[PDB]
Amino acid sequence: SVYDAAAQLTADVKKDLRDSWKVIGSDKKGNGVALFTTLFADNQETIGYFKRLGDVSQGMANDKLRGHSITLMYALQNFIDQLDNPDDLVCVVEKFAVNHITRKISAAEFGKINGPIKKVLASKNFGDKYANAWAKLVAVVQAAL
Amino acid sequence: SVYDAAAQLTADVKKDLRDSWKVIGSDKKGNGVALFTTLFADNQETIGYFKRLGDVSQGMANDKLRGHSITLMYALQNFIDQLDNPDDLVCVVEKFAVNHITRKISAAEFGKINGPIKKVLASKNFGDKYANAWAKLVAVVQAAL
Ligand code: HEM
Ligand code: HEM
């Protein structure tokens, strides 16, 4: 359950999420676009869900892709800001899941974002410890799908 | 059309938006719920779009309503952060409009949020000067609906 998954966010996991977000969230446009372009590069099968975005290979030059990428980063900002209160984190995650459930995005499908997150983290000198912390946060969302 | 509306965001307007957001955005849960519940209080008919939230009369205690209210504030955070780059502001506004267009929310309907914003600003001692600046930001979104 989402309530059980949220309880897995221990003290050090929360701390590692904040420390890495301080850097990653500093450039939402740049890191947001890097995150999603990596998703399409490593998992081309997911491109089908983004027909509305057009030619995603254009990257930053694609206004729709840039708009989506910047916006995605504010969902992550929301999650990080709610780490202090489990009740608020859960209600924001459930709210976030609504549209993804309607698009038939499964937990397994959503989990494909872990790879891209690990790579972006590594590009900023944040290793496995941080990738694992982020996988824990992603797992809270997966529990809601 | 959206670019034209964005042109109304003059230097002075952006300054008032940033200055008032420094306060309003410091308590996203509190002010987001105040904003949302005021919308329902002044325009009861808007509740028709929120059947999924359940018993909205519960206010803050309603987890779904609270989740939506907090999340709403990050869309505004996004807009405020993109004020200095029209190209980015426009793409984030158009991205934001997609789901609202699908919900058949007209520009006129969306404009009903102006009253609630004026009241929330006033509760923090921000006068008409600030309410007018916010109405101009809302107008950018209206141009995309
Ligand atoms: C860290 C992970 C992710 C975050 C933070 C995220 C965030 C968002 C946000 C904020 C929106 C806009 C609001 C909405 O329409 O729900 C959105 C839209 C969307 N997301 Fe997610 N998402 C993530 C991963 C994914 C994945 C892995 C898929 C599918 C494989 C997915 C598919 C979609 C689609 C198709 C849209 C609509 C795009 C459009 O037409 O503009 N998302 N997502
Ligand atoms: C400045 C004001 C507003 C902001 C910043 C805002 C923001 C948001 C955000 C970020 C979402 C989640 C993503 C999505 O599904 O699109 C959302 C959902 C929604 N918004 Fe807007 N919105 C605003 C005003 C309105 C108004 C005036 C209406 C209708 C009278 C409206 C109706 C909806 C509905 C029905 C949902 C889905 C709620 C749910 O089932 O969870 N929004 N809005």
UniProtKB/Swiss-Prot annotation, chains A, B:
Residues 8-145 form the Globin domain. InterPro entries: Globin, Globin-like_OT, Globin-like_sf, Globin/Proto, Mb-like_M. Its main location: cytoplasm. GO terms for molecular function: heme binding; identical protein binding; metal ion binding; oxygen binding; oxygen carrier activity. It is found in: Cytoplasm. Heme b binds at residue 100. Keywords: Cytoplasm, Heme, Iron, Metal-binding, Oxygen transport, Transport. Pfam families: Globin. SUPFAM superfamilies: Globin-like. One of its GO terms (cellular component) is cytoplasm. It comes from the Eukaryota. Homodimer. Belongs to the globin family. This is Globin-1. It comes from Anadara inaequivalvis.
